[PDB]
Amino acid sequence: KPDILWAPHHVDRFVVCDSELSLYHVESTVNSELKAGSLRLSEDSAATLLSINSDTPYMKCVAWYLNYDPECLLAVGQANGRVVLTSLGQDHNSKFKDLIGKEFVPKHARQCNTLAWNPLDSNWLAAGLDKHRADFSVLIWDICSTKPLYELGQNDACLSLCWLPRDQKLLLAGMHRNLAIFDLRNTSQKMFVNTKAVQGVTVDPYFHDRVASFYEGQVAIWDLRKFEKPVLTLTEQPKPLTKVAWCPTRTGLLATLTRDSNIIRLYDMQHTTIIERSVQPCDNYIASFAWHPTSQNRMIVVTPNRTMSDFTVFERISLAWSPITSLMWACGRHLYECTEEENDNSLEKDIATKMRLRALSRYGLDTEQVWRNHILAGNEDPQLKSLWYTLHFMKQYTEDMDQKSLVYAGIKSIVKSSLGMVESSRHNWSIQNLNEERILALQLCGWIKKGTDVDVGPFLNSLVQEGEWERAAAVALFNLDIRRAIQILNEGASSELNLNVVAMALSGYTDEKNSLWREMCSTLRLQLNNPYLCVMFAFLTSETGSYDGVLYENKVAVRDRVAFACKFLSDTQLNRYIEKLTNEMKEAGNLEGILLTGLTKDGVDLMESYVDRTGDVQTASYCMLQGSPLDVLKDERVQYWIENYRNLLDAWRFWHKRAEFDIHRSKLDPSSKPLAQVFVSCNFCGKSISYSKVTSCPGCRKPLPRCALCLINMGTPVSSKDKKLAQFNNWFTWCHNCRHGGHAGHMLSWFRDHAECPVSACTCKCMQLDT
Amino acid sequence: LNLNVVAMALSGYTDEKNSLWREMCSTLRLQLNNPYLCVMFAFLTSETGSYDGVLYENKVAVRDRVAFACKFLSDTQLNRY
Amino acid sequence: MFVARSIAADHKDLIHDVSFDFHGRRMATCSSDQSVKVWDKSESGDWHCTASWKTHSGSVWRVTWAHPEFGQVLASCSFDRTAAVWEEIVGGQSHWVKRTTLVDSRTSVTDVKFAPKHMGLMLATCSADGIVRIYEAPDVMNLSQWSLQHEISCKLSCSCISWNPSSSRAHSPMIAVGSDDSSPNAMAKVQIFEYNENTRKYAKAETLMTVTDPVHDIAFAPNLGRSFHILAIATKDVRIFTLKPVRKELTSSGGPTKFEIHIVAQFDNHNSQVWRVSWNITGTVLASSGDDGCVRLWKANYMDNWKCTGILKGNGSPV
Ligand SMILES: [Zn+2]
Ligand SMILES: [Zn+2]
């Protein structure tokens, strides 16, 4: 049974027992590469072999001497019973070399089962051997510097033995079928109790009255003060147990390892229910393990392939969160706080952090020009830009109409009433002839500016200045001007080469039913990378009326597809296409569909899906307040979102910003009732004094209460670089407990200089109650 | 990836006198890099009989030009060239 | 994308549980010596202890805060079959005072939790005998008086409970209870009770059949206006469930609401018994701690799929 032992007084030296006994030293390797011949015990630890000994074949039991000198001194008992004292340190100054190599031979050849040193006196060695016919099984000898000092357990089997940590003359031993406690004062004086578990007897260092034993896969605990029946029994394991050990650096902690297992089972007996835990140190079975005597909660395990791993046993960890997305946890007796890395790439941050950052930057309060909110978003996201531009266009149309409701109904509602459109049979390559609903839809899409202009030229030039060549060319072609698109492609290829060959390919448009160009373009059209080119060629190659390739392309912005369907597709199928697109947008929760649904119940469902996907309520709350119809604001979900956002603001103590949001919401939504609070009542009439001398009750004309400092009746007139009618210094103030009060300024000064209620015979510390 | 677009463009061959294809391909072919593409488009867009553009292109190997001239040119024109 | 730091706080004994206040400015920690400590954060950002005392005769398991609207209130459950309520009074040195003790349990009180704010000042305790007791304080200005409102038997050793933080007008109060029994038989380990207004009694609504291993921790996620509820279960593997209510027919309103149960994430990266699970404020990041001495942070992605985002170790050394 291979085993590893630490140095009793050295933290860096340990020994591994096998057919060859190997003494190793532990060194750091964090700042140095893998040293030659050094075993990487862990990621940053290296073990350097100190010595090898092969003079002990068939080792049976091993012990390490206690006293400091000499260093690396051990005792090995063999199968024949010979017990030899060996050393592995480089000791050129041995104190008593006579003990070096000293061997004790049993009178009768029997195998020594266990061997141990006396802690109180290092010169005493106790060894339990095999059961002789009529001879003692336990021998206590003196190493000094002829015969064992003591012999006991005749015709018995000493499975295991241990010393009393405090008593220098008390021993515990495991007989063939019983457990015995013996005193050196009198050999006859012994307490023997029959038991079945006799292997691996050990005592908890912190509790000298606690002992452990195990038989097969069952483990029992004993209390020496009342050792008559086992105090407790652990759960029996399938595989037989192999080693049991107390942790010296932690109270009430026991460790167990069984046969052919890669997991060590730990038990917490410090309850007086035993807490059970398991630790996996490596990917292979552990041959043995050893607690570090002094290092805190450190244990080293050994694998049969001569690979050793040393590790610390962590305790149970407790967790807690904070409203600033900082995770604080506790492990043992230390506290650690974890936050997000402050990297430049802010697009991957959590939704809560982004919401906080947007709140700090007045996100959504720019009512002068709505589209700037995407700039205020801080990050780049097409959905937000699309939403804000849509809102800006709708607001612009509302303002124009007011200068000169249906807009917020959405594209679907607007085009639901469209009538009188005739499809084109052939393309003439060369707006106001179209129905009003489609003109309004195009205005919403942003292709055409306000008015009845029948030219998209300003839009094309804006795109050209924007540098989006392909999109501008696609729009121009959709407006049925091939030469304009070719010119735009040439202009784009002039700056920054594929655009030229694309343009020269574009001139091959033919109407032949079996056109070679048509066939090849249809076949290899999708191989391009830019989606706009793909949809352009799809439109060119598509037959009359059947434009499914253009319509059902997901890589193109919804606005362009909507406009293209508006100007070309027939209404009878346009309604169906709009319905299908609206449904597939709603089920996905993409925000670009707001243009379709509008601020209606469909918009509410789309927003709910969006919130479910991402958990953002700030954008939903700000969006739904933009001139929504009264019925929309009456829905439960919208108000729930608003309340959750307000609670979130209260969590971060952004009190002033919450007040600004409340002002904005109250201005936009009349349905909301402001907070309810207390009001003052007249003593005589009993009515409210809220809204003919000022200092008189409006109802009874009787005097009001008087300031406790100025002795003047309080009062305030009731109904921009101007004068102020009612200064803050003249408002009512009172202590909510003592019910005394007066003017704001007077009491402010008085409590700045004093700490008691200003009324005589009042003991309230009014201003200290609130903090 | 350019080759796919080149092949797509190549499909537009037409013998129409005032075709937009022939109008634009001859103008735009001079801005390519590989001389072989330029000579191909020049040959396609050239008027019948006078294939001077391909013949007098010095950025291409002589053997190909010689073979092309042998396959098509008339005897007297071949001798003079 | 998560980095760690060590806070300069000194403790002499092992820490069992730590808990934050609502605003994240106050901390409560229970130690191994039946001691409770309160820490405050200064404006500079440093932490300082402000109080300390010994509470119970047995071990102290859990300590939790109450909502600030009711003042400064702490609730502590102990192994000595008691649950104590403490309130801070200052005259300024803080002077915490015990106000009441609940002793109705016959076994060790395993866990204690506070109800959400919108239901008043209610409290729940699950014991080891399989009993969940719900108390209420009728008067918020007199915390010395409490009345046992409800009592539920689970027939299994309760180990942890969690309220439903939803505050909508359409969701009845919900409480979920786990168990840690290791019986060889395959029996359910998680049950959910939904309050019924028509009967004013809690009734079992849904039981998680797919969960049969012992359960150590269970946590609802904050609602935040979603259309369904998210639950996190800690076992040999971290599991996440989503519960969606079904449309209740207007023909007749009966017993508990029927639910659709779907698992959306099951992680086994700890390779051990996961011990604690918790949610952030928005219910979008999940923190899990197991026996491997590691803390793992999970989050959703663009495809609405759950994947790990952070791994740390108890010592604070990054992985
Ligand atoms: Zn009056
Ligand atoms: Zn007073």
Ligand SMILES: [Zn+2]
């Ligand atoms: Zn007062």
Ligand SMILES: [Zn+2]
């Ligand atoms: Zn006054």
